[PDB]
């Protein structure tokens, strides 16, 4: 017994059921080089992609273009005079004008 009510004692309980109620948690191997991602690309990956674009005539998707442009824009202040020429020539060959040329004019 006690001062309060005994029945008025809510208890946590699941309102449904499923097979993932006892799935143990484990730490999977973590990637060692995260820079390999286009999103998180670097000066080396940028140059490799530019060389691939100049070599191949493949018609890539919009996403690639977008991401490539954005990354370059972001990292414009880290490029070298030799790498800027390659990156701009890729665009010129593929006939793409996403405002990239204006941005590089401030750092060239």
């Amino acid at each position: 017994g006690g001062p309060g009510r005994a029945l008025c004692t809510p208890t946590f309980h699941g309102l449904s059921d499923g097979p993932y109620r006892r799935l143990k948690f484990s730490l999977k191997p973590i990637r060692h080089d995260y820079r390999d991602v286009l999103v998180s690309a670097d000066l080396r990956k940028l140059a490799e992609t530019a060389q691939e674009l100049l070599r191949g005539k493949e018609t890539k998707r919009r996403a690639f273009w977008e991401i490539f442009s954005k990354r370059v824009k972001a990292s414009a202040h880290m490029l070298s005079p030799s790498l800027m020429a390659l990156i701009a020539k890729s665009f010129d060959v593929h006939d793409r004008d996403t405002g990239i040329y204006v941005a590089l004019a401030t750092v060239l």
């Binding site: 948690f25 730490l27 880290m78």
Partner: protein, 105 residues
């Protein structure tokens, strides 16, 4: 942790005739290690453990020393920092175009 002991004692002081000064105190009142007395759930564990990946992920994405420093700062409380973590940050800092050694960060 069957039993977690924690008490707030009446420490010595002098508050009488106190003058309001717009300044921060010495330090926090609570410093004792926080030890849970219950097993965590999957989501809790995940949130606790995701730092290992998020750190690197954000370091990689960073594009300036400011960002780098900020990122590093955010995961301050994160214990058990492997050596390679330092190496990564150093490499990124050098690539970004240097940093401020004098920086508290």
């Amino acid at each position: 942790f069957f039993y977690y002991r924690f008490h707030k004692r009446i420490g010595k002081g002098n508050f009488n005739r106190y003058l309001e000064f717009y300044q921060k105190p010495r330090g926090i009142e609570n410093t004792l290690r926080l030890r849970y007395n219950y097993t965590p759930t999957f989501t809790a564990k995940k949130r606790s453990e995701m730092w290992k990946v998020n750190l690197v992920k954000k370091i990689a994405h960073a594009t300036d020393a400011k960002q780098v420093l900020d990122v590093w700062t955010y995961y301050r409380h994160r214990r058990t920092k492997r050596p390679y973590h330092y190496l990564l940050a150093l490499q990124r800092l050098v690539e970004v175009g240097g940093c401020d050694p004098t920086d508290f960060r």
